[PDB]
């Protein structure tokens, strides 16, 4: 499955900025038309927590206006210590998709928007595949 989804226990717990109109939850409802939006500066981050610490084969994001993005794993069951997974510069316009096949155990996944193409940015979908 995809443990991103609220329904496979997917849950954001440590977002760095929020507007109740576009809450982190909007990243894991599987819809493409809802999103989470940043409220100002950079960087910004948020921490997704999956039901169990699982093997991740592929990670994938749907975003608007993101330029540099970084992702970090934590296989322990308290988000004590994170370890870098990757880092990606993106490009222009107004939706971005990204795919990353990876092979890691993780329980928490941190996503950092390190810089944007504008003043604000959005994340519409986050998908985490593996078992």
């Amino acid at each position: 499955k995809d443990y991103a989804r609220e329904e496979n226990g997917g849950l954001v717990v440590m977002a760095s900025c929020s507007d109740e109109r576009f809450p982190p939850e909007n990243m894991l409802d599987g819809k493409d038309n809802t999103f989470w939006v940043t409220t100002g500066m950079f960087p910004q981050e948020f921490v997704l927590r999956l039901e169990s610490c699982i093997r991740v084969s592929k990670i994938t994001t749907l975003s608007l206006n993101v330029r540099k993005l970084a992702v970090e794993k934590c296989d322990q069951d308290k988000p004590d210590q994170f370890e870098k997974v990757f880092e990606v510069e993106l490009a222009n316009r107004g939706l971005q998709t990204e795919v990353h096949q990876v092979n890691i155990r993780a329980k928490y996944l941190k996503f950092i928007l390190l810089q944007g193409h504008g003043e604000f940015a959005t994340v519409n979908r986050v998908s985490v595949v593996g078992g």
């Binding site: 409220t39 100002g40 540099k68 939706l95 810089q115 944007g116």
Partner: protein, 175 residues
């Protein structure tokens, strides 16, 4: 807090000569409650103004991923014409210095009063206007009353284009 449903953040360069009393204008806007938060009147939105008095600006500036300054509060001292001049130069290369030339520099001009031993307010309002800048005169002698207006002004200008961009986003993604 009030019933705050969104907190936005905004990097604001606070520029102008050392002897125009920037410290005072900030600290009083800051201290006044008891990073400068203001909630936008008639909303549940709070805006945190990140106030960069020019060693702070520099720290910011040489950090990685640093992304320019697009909000500014220009302060001068009615007592020193030359302090006004400096604001204008600042202003122009802040416009020049923007990474993204397609985002307007949003600024506010403030007239202050260093209680210590000349500018034409007259001309300053005009310049401000000609450059589409809100102009706020503090110098009159209300230390404490309306230090807030500039900050609130700038914070509101920021609020608004947030709402702009956010709607633009909803536009761009259905479905």
């Amino acid at each position: 807090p009030i019933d705050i449903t969104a907190t936005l953040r905004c990097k604001v360069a606070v520029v102008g000569e050392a002897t125009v009393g920037k410290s005072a204008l900030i600290s009083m806007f800051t201290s006044k409650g008891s990073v400068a938060p203001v909630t936008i009147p008639d909303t549940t939105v709070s805006v945190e103004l990140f106030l960069l008095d020019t060693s702070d600006l520099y720290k910011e500036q040489i950090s990685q991923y640093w992304n320019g300054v697009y909000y500014a509060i220009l302060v001068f001292d009615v007592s020193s014409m030359e302090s006004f001049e400096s604001c204008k130069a600042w202003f122009e290369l802040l416009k020049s210095a923007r990474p993204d030339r397609e985002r307007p520099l949003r600024a506010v001009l403030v007239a202050n009063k260093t209680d210590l031993p000349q500018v034409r307010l007259d001309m300053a309002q005009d310049w401000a206007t000609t450059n589409t800048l809100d102009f706020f005169d503090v110098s009159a002698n209300p230390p404490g009353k309306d230090a807030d207006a500039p900050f609130l002004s700038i914070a509101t200008t920021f609020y608004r284009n947030y709402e702009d961009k956010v709607a633009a986003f909803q536009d761009a993604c259905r479905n």
